[PDB]
Amino acid sequence: EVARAQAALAVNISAARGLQDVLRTNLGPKGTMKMLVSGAGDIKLTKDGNVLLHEMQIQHPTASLIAKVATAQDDITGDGTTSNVLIIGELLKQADLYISEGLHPRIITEGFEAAKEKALQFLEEVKVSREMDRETLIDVARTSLRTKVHAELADVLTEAVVDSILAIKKQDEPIDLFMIEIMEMKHKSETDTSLIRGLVLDHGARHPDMKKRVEDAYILTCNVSLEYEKTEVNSGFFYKSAEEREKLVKAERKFIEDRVKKIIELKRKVCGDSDKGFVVINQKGIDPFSLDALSKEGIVALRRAKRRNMERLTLACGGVALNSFDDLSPDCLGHAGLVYEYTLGEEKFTFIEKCNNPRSVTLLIKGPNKHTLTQIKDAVRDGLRAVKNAIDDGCVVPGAGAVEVAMAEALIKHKPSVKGRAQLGVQAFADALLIIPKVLAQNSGFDLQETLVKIQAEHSESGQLVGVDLNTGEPMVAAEVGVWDNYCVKKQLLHSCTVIATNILLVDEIMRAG
Amino acid sequence: AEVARAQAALAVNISAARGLQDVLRTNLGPKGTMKMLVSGAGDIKLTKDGNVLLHEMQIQHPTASLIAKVATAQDDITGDGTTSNVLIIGELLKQADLYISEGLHPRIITEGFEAAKEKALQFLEEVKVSREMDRETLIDVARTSLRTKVHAELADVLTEAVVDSILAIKKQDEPIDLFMIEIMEMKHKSETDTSLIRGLVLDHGARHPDMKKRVEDAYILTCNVSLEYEKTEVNSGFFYKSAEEREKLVKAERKFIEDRVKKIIELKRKVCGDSDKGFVVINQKGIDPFSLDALSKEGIVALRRAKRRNMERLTLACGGVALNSFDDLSPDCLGHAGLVYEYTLGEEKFTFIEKCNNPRSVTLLIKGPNKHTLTQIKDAVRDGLRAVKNAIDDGCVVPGAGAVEVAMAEALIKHKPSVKGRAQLGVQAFADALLIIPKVLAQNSGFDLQETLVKIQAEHSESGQLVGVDLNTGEPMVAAEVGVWDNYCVKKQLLHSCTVIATNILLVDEIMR
Amino acid sequence: MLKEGAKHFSGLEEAVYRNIQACKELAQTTRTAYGPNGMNKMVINHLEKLFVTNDAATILRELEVQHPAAKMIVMASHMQEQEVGDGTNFVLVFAGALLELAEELLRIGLSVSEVIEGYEIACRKAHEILPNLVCCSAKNLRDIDEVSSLLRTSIMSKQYGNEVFLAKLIAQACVSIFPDSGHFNVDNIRVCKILGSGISSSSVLHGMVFKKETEGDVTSVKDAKIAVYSCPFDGMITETKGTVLIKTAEELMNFSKGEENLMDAQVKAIADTGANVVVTGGKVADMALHYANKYNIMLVRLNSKWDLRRLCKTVGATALPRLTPPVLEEMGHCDSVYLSEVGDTQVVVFKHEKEDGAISTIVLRGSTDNLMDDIERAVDDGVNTFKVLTRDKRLVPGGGATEIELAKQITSYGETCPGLEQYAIKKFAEAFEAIPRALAENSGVKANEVISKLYAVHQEGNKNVGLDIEAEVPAVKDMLEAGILDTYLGKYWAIKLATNAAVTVLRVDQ
């Protein structure tokens, strides 16, 4: 079929609206989490702009298009993405009128540009260079956390969030690459969350009391087993022919104690003293007697370790992954400043913590392991992006859309065009800005009206960035509030909202292709 | 029972009103068009005037009742801009609806209109100046008054004649002219033609070569009870019931005929001299067959069928008084206009009573063979006469061409309503309703109703420019300099009549069927 | 939505209606299911088998709704049932009841957070004032009464009259063997239901009670090295050839004897590994039996996994099919491993006694399964309510003499704390009346009649509803002392728990 001209955009405008309504609170602590059945058929809860999109199976092309484009920004920030859907279709709701008044969507796409630039100009003029204080990091962390979860949940989790990034900036890494390791853990309540400067393995191998409490940890990560097999035929060697099986029966049990006593050597090679617990870590299993022959010597051998840990352990401890054991010095097997196998429930989760150059900080969350515990697994990594963004930009402003007004004010107050053609677009342009802070207030409390004419006159009074109190519905200084817009965060929505609106605002013929 | 209530109920209202007004966008100015109205008479009624169209044939609406008041009111208080008012109110409603679409209370939207109007009122009080009441300054307004109501080519050919009538005043204080409107109409070879005549003209005369073709000293005896009777301001009773009463009825009536015509002919000798002056008999009823040619040959001009409106205008115009009767009486009572001239044009005999002691009565002879044209142009004269009089009655004239509407919208610069934000919407809704006329013209003109309008504002915001959309090419120009001026009393009155109904809209949230 | 996209079934009205309404659906019976309950519920579980109870969780897990609303909150009800044996009958009703104030406040037009947060701080205020209403504490597990006194409350919150013989029988199962200090175990004390005898013949044999036929002799030793095996007999006779027995006439000769010597070696290898009891979820065979009679290793003819499971659980045994010589890994645990006739049913009996690790095995002799399993249900959720792992349970009024105190506490205070939250704080003190109603439900009177009088009992902690007419006309039964209190904790969770999901399930418009 064909939805011609005005009809094609009438589809575009609509598909934006109802979803924007969902996200008027998906955003802020006021933001209401949303759940998904038909997205899978699973019981699924999520709060965030882009992920909920992908989670749902979204038949409508607009939403289908959006999940991809908001991604690129949701890649960066994670919050303001739950914001981003509003301004876009709202701008459609702006301009469609003008083309319903009659006009070219051309000149309005045109018109948005210089407004986008003055915004981009204003984005510079607004963005407040701020410091790297963990405090300054906390409020940027928690505002995204506050957006995505409860402020309490934001608060209690914020610390570990703004902590690891300090050690990942200890690497002088401008972003967060490692220390991104999150661990959900068996618990009655998601209340428990811990910050492990080192890593956590989940296993003690199968053998307790190996000297599993380890202060001096020289980390052997060995992807090869001490358990090849205890029976006749080798681990990968299978035989249904009789004479070939009698061949492997003798040395299969041996090549274990080959690798076993290599460690028993390697223990004394590393240590010479059972005093320092030497940590063997296996990506695969390890024989009980292997553990036994190791454990009694004080060797703590771990089996069935995870490849990311193997990666992490190699990196965090200055560790090593090994396909052989033999004998090596303590440092040839990277060092963890502390290692403790920690049993919660049945599983003993090895705390390998403050590894030498603890390049990977495991953030451990002990919870019901529901999607509720998954529901808090996002805001953190989301907030991680935010502080990473805050790490990225020293320039960060008040949140709660204090910029919106100060944008919408100046950008509109002056004609950046001193034209109709661009100002027409500019008019629509900076108007769709204010959607967020007013509706937040309007969702919180006081209507769009008062808060705006508050915050506008306030900004008009101020030039300070004054922004909504999301628990009141009238503005405050969001610099003082703590809800803080990273220039890295806030900038990209200006890119997206414009650049997406550009081509989608210009369509007339639409048809099934193929 | 059946009750429509609150938000969904007022929709049909604002759907009607805004839906009903948008048809009038075809009107209001020469780029707009005369709108054709037809009735059960099948009469094609061509008016760009809102009132004419509005109060005759329309679609049933609850708003259709209320709107019929305002375009009447603005016609009443002005005679112009009756098409104007309509397009502002729904433009304000369309604005207002958004905020109510925002859920923001029609009460909070209602209560913000009034300061905003006052603002613009005060502002239109600011952008007004006292202008001339000069004919040429009226032409500046007459050109402008007519076009936003009637047609421009009509406006132009009307502009000189419309002002001339309202210029004929004695300096009346009247915002519209009662006796400066005397409309003669005719079937012509010109479907639209209008002659400009100061003084009064007669509906019908009776022209005879026996009667004086030119009566220079005109003592006009203007009488209802006619030649068939004798010294009577009142008709005499007939009895046809029986034979002997009717037998004596037809014989003596000629005495009533004879004395009457005698009453004039001896009185002409008295009043007008013998042949020395011309005499004027007006028979507002028929003329007797004897008396017709008898008054004819005595120098008297007997005039068949002058109206009761001719009766009153004559007395006022010529300073005399119309009688009921032909009896011997002084010349002064008998109407005297310094010329009585019976001008027979078409099949209609138009008796001028001219050089009138009061040029209060002044006449326009409309022309057309086609009635719809005769409808249009004869209707096209009145509004300006009422409109342009509002220029010559008022020392102040408000500048036109929508230049002042862009002027307030920014002069309404906001958080001036820092009060709440409901008045801030009441002004924000109101600033946009101002521009519907500057829109609808550039609309009805080329280009954009907006792109020019924002040029206008971007221009008007520049200093020294009160600038506006052309009523024709739709291009930016300073309106007060072109002389294009709507009557002063329009705007101030217009704003009140505009806001009230739109204000009345939001106070009605309930409708019960 | 309007657009073909947007997967969801929840939102807006259907949230402020259907979700909460679907939440309303299930709490309906939970009312009849908590406190003294004369009500009963037929259930077929996809056996088509009827079962009768008052408990929701048994039923609700089965019930399947489109909407996670029901699907979520049960987890909290489980989260209760996980931590606390009973009150879960209540844990659902309050939330569902407290919820529907919101949709009213939504008709009254109160915001999500606005409605939520009032309950929140009031819930904290509750969690603040809730321990203030601790009216007692438990004392001694060794004491049967001190335990049984409470235990009725939960059995009550399942079923009313039975609780008396039961609660005593429970601590007589020795809840006391465990300290209830950081430890307690069901599987050690595990209910074992003997169909037959009486339902009040339900007994206590400390140490395992296995209704399974106790075969061989008594165990070779009472310490018995216990090798439990899933199917150590798959048969040592093979099923092959023509008749699904034999084909050739020569076939039968080797089929019959082969089972023997294999099982002989098998049951010898039971003695060779040293297992002093043989447990066969696999079949019993008289030769193997006679071998188990020769080698004198007590035999178990058939096993539910529950047998194998507990044997795997308790003994440290590992049930494995052995067509294989048995090898003790399972080894022994229980110091006295017996044959017994309990209910005069052959009862496989293992016993070992330890302050922690002792099996003190509830043996239910009973006339009716359909009862004895629901009789199991209350004692289950009663001893699981005994599970607090505070020997002093900081007791509060049981059967809910609390709510009237708190319904007074909060909404009064609820107005003191100001702002529209106060109404949510004041709505917070309302759904307390649920069980006062839910008992007056099964008691048959008006909660208003209840609460009006039970507000008129004012500061009490004692007088409240129950069964009979003293929950009806006065609505006054002493729910501090009928002998009935409840732990602060199981109470403390329900508020805390039903705070969460209720708050949660509202937030979600998708």
CA C147 from centre of chain = 17
> CB B454 to CB A419 under 8 A?
yes
The DSSP code sequence of A322-364 is ES--S---TTTS-EEEEEEEEESSSSEEEEEEEESS----EEE
Cα–Cα nearest to B349, from B213, B202, B223: B202
Return the SS3 of A476.
strand
**Nearest chain A CA: its distance from C454 CA (Å):** 35
Question: C84: which chain A residues are within 8 Å (Cβ-Cβ)?
Answer: none
| Cβ neighbours of residue A327 closer than 8 Å, sequence gap 6 or more | A262, A265, A266, A269
| C-alpha separations of B281 from A192, B284, B313, B326 in Å | 117, 9, 16, 8
Interior CA angle at B402 toward B398 and B405, to 5°?
85
C72 at the A interface (CB within 8 A)? yes
Which residue in this structure is represented by tokens 């519209």? B176
Which of B421, B450, B451 has the CB atom closest to A449's CB atom?
A: B421
Return the SS3 of C470.
coil
DSSP H or E stretch at residue A35 = strand A34-36
Question: B103: which chain A residues are within 8 Å (Cβ-Cβ)?
Answer: 447
A:C CB pairs within 8 Å: 89
Q: How far apart are CA A114 and CA A437, in angstroms?
A: 23
Identify whether A48 is a catalytic site residue: yes
Question: B99: which chain A residues are within 8 Å (Cβ-Cβ)?
Answer: 449
**How many CB atoms sit inside 10 A of residue A347's CB?**
14
> CB B104 to CB A449 under 8 A?
yes
Pairing label, strands C336-342, C395-397: unpaired
Q: What residues does B202 pair with on adjacent strands?
A: none
| Half-sphere CA count of B487, side-chain side, radius 13 A | 33
Pinpoint the alpha helices (H) of A198-280.
Answer: 242-270
Q: Quick one: CA dihedral C493, C499, C502, C508, positive or negative?
A: negative
Q: Spot the catalytic one: B83, B159, B222, B375.
A: B83
Rg, chain B, Cα only: 28
Q: How far apart are CA C430 and CA C406, in angstroms?
A: 9
Q: How far apart are CA A90 and CA A85, in angstroms?
A: 8
Cα–Cα nearest to A280, from A354, A204, A229: A204
Question: A421: which chain B residues are within 8 Å (Cβ-Cβ)?
Answer: 451
Query: Tokens in use for B152?
Result: 């421009």
Q: Using N-to-C axis directions, what is the helix angle for A242-270 and A288-296, rounded to 10°?
A: 20
Q: Quick one: CA dihedral B371, B373, B378, B380, positive or negative?
A: positive
Cα–Cα nearest to C344, from C451, C184, C121, C195: C195
Q: How far apart are CA C361 and CA B269, in angstroms?
A: 151
A474 at the B interface (CB within 8 A)? no
| Half-sphere CA count of B188, side-chain side, radius 13 A | 17
Q: What are phi and psi of B339, to 5 degrees?
A: -145, 130
Pinpoint the alpha helices (H) of A353-483.
Answer: 371-392, 402-413, 421-433, 435-444, 448-461, 478-481
Which residue in this structure is represented by tokens 């060779």? C272
> CB C113 to CB A19 under 8 A?
no
Q: Is C109 exposed, middle or buried (0-12, 13-18, 19+ CB in 10 A)?
A: exposed
The residue type at C499: T
> CB C71 to CB A43 under 8 A?
yes
B272 near B217, Cβ under 8 Å?
A: yes
**How many CB atoms sit inside 10 A of residue A165's CB?**
26
**How many CB atoms sit inside 10 A of residue A345's CB?**
11
Question: B418: which chain A residues are within 8 Å (Cβ-Cβ)?
Answer: 453, 457
Pairing label, strands B218-223, B278-283: parallel
C277 near C262, Cβ under 8 Å?
A: no
Q: Spot the catalytic one: A25, A46, A48, A216.
A: A48
| Cβ neighbours of residue A423 closer than 8 Å, sequence gap 6 or more | A111, A415, A416, A417, B454, B458
What is residue C471's DSSP assignment? T
What approach was used to elucidate this structure? Answer: cryo-EM
> CB B415 to CB A449 under 8 A?
no
Query: Tokens in use for B331?
Result: 């010349």
Question: B413: which chain A residues are within 8 Å (Cβ-Cβ)?
Answer: none
Q: How far apart are CA A394 and CA A391, in angstroms?
A: 7
3-state secondary structure A408-422: HHHHHHCCCCCCCHH
Cα–Cα nearest to C316, from C364, C357, C282: C357
Q: What are phi and psi of B343, to 5 degrees?
A: -105, 105
Query: Tokens in use for B256?
Result: 């009533």
| Cβ neighbours of residue B471 closer than 8 Å, sequence gap 6 or more | B29, B30, B31, B144, B147, B148, B152, B401, B441, B445, B484
Strands (E), C111-246: 192-195, 203-205, 214-215, 226-229
CA dihedral A62, A65, A68, A71 (to 10 degrees): -30
Pairing label, strands B45-47, B362-367: unpaired
B411 near B466, Cβ under 8 Å?
A: no
Q: How far apart are CA B455 and CA B439, in angstroms?
A: 12
Question: A418: which chain B residues are within 8 Å (Cβ-Cβ)?
Answer: 458
Q: What are phi and psi of C509, to 5 degrees?
A: -95, 10
- Ramachandran area for residue B350 (φ above 0: left; ψ -120 to 50: alpha; else beta): beta
C290 near C311, Cβ under 8 Å?
A: no
Closest Cα in chain B to A414 = B458
Specify the long-range contacts of residues A164-168, CB closer than 8 Å, at least 24 apart: A164/A195, A164/A197, A164/A361, A164/A363, A164/A384, A165/A137, A165/A384, A165/A387, A165/A388, A165/A391, A166/A134, A167/A197, A167/A358, A167/A361, A168/A359, A168/A361
Helices (H) and strands (E) in chain B, counts: 19, 19
What is residue C71's DSSP assignment? H
| Cβ neighbours of residue C335 closer than 8 Å, sequence gap 6 or more | C222, C223, C351, C352, C353
Q: What residues does C365 pair with on adjacent strands?
A: C194
**How many CB atoms sit inside 10 A of residue C304's CB?**
12
Q: What residues does A438 pair with on adjacent strands?
A: none
C276 near C221, Cβ under 8 Å?
A: yes
Query: Tokens in use for A62?
Result: 């607009």
A494 near A502, Cβ under 8 Å?
A: no
Q: How far apart are CA B206 and CA B114, in angstroms?
A: 60
Q: Using N-to-C axis directions, what is the helix angle for C163-172 and C369-386, rounded to 10°?
A: 60
> Is position B371 annotated in a ligand binding site?
no
The DSSP code sequence of B201-236 is E-S-----SSS-SEESSEEEEEESS-TTSSS-SS--
Which of B104, B422, B451 has the CB atom closest to A420's CB atom?
A: B451
| Cβ neighbours of residue B242 closer than 8 Å, sequence gap 6 or more | none
| C-alpha separations of C416 from A242, C128, C423, C459 in Å | 87, 16, 10, 19
| Cβ neighbours of residue A179 closer than 8 Å, sequence gap 6 or more | A164, A165, A167, A168, A359, A360, A361, A363
Rg, chain C, Cα only: 28
Query: Tokens in use for C316?
Result: 């440290």
Mutation site for B-interface testing, chosen from A99, A418, A447 by largest number of B Cβ within 10 Å: A447
Cα–Cα nearest to B390, from B138, B100, B71: B138
Q: Spot the catalytic one: A81, A136, A158, A362.
A: A81
Question: A102: which chain B residues are within 8 Å (Cβ-Cβ)?
Answer: 448-449
Pairing label, strands C477-478, C485-487: unpaired
Closest Cα in chain C to A375 = C504
**How many CB atoms sit inside 10 A of residue A260's CB?**
25
Cα–Cα nearest to C229, from C331, C318, C309, C290: C318
| Cβ neighbours of residue C48 closer than 8 Å, sequence gap 6 or more | none
Q: How far apart are CA C240 and CA C250, in angstroms?
A: 13
**Nearest chain B CA: its distance from A96 CA (Å):** 14
Query: Tokens in use for A410?
Result: 């100046």
Q: How far apart are CA A356 and CA A317, in angstroms?
A: 5
Which of A29, A36, A60 has the CB atom closest to C5's CB atom?
A: A60
> CB B454 to CB A98 under 8 A?
no
Identify whether B83 is a catalytic site residue: yes
**Nearest chain B CA: its distance from A447 CA (Å):** 8
| C-alpha separations of C195 from B191, C162, C373 in Å | 115, 17, 10
Q: How far apart are CA C294 and CA C284, in angstroms?
A: 15
The DSSP code sequence of C358-418 is ---EEEEEES-HHHHHHHHHHHHHHHHHHTTS-SS--EEETTSSHHHHHHHHHHHHHHHS-
Query: Tokens in use for B45?
Result: 């009624």
What is residue A406's DSSP assignment? H
Closest Cα in chain B to A98 = B450
Identify whether A374 is a catalytic site residue: no
Which residue in this structure is represented by tokens 């009031």? C122
Closest Cα in chain B to A449 = B421
**CB < 8 Å from B in window 301-360 of A:** none
User: Which residues does A contribute to its contact with C (CB < 8 Å)?
Assistant: 14-15, 17-19, 22, 25, 29-30, 32-39, 43, 45, 52, 55-60, 62-64, 188, 368, 370, 443-445, 471
Q: Is B245 exposed, middle or buried (0-12, 13-18, 19+ CB in 10 A)?
A: exposed
Query: Tokens in use for A129?
Result: 């260079």
3-state secondary structure B430-482: HHHHHCHHHHHHHHHCCCCCCHHHHHHHHHHHCCCCCEEECCCCCCEEEHHHH
What is residue A320's DSSP assignment? E
Q: How far apart are CA A178 and CA C177, in angstroms?
A: 50
Q: What residues does A468 pair with on adjacent strands?
A: A475
| Cβ neighbours of residue A491 closer than 8 Å, sequence gap 6 or more | A120, A123
Q: Quick one: CA dihedral A495, A497, A498, A499, positive or negative?
A: positive
C191 near C380, Cβ under 8 Å?
A: yes
Identify whether A82 is a catalytic site residue: yes
B424 at the A interface (CB within 8 A)? yes
Q: What residues does B300 pair with on adjacent strands?
A: B279
Q: How far apart are CA B110 and CA B426, in angstroms?
A: 7
| Cβ neighbours of residue C309 closer than 8 Å, sequence gap 6 or more | C319
Q: Spot the catalytic one: B97, B140, B383, B393.
A: B383
C13 at the A interface (CB within 8 A)? no
> Is position C490 annotated in a ligand binding site?
no
Closest Cα in chain B to A451 = B421
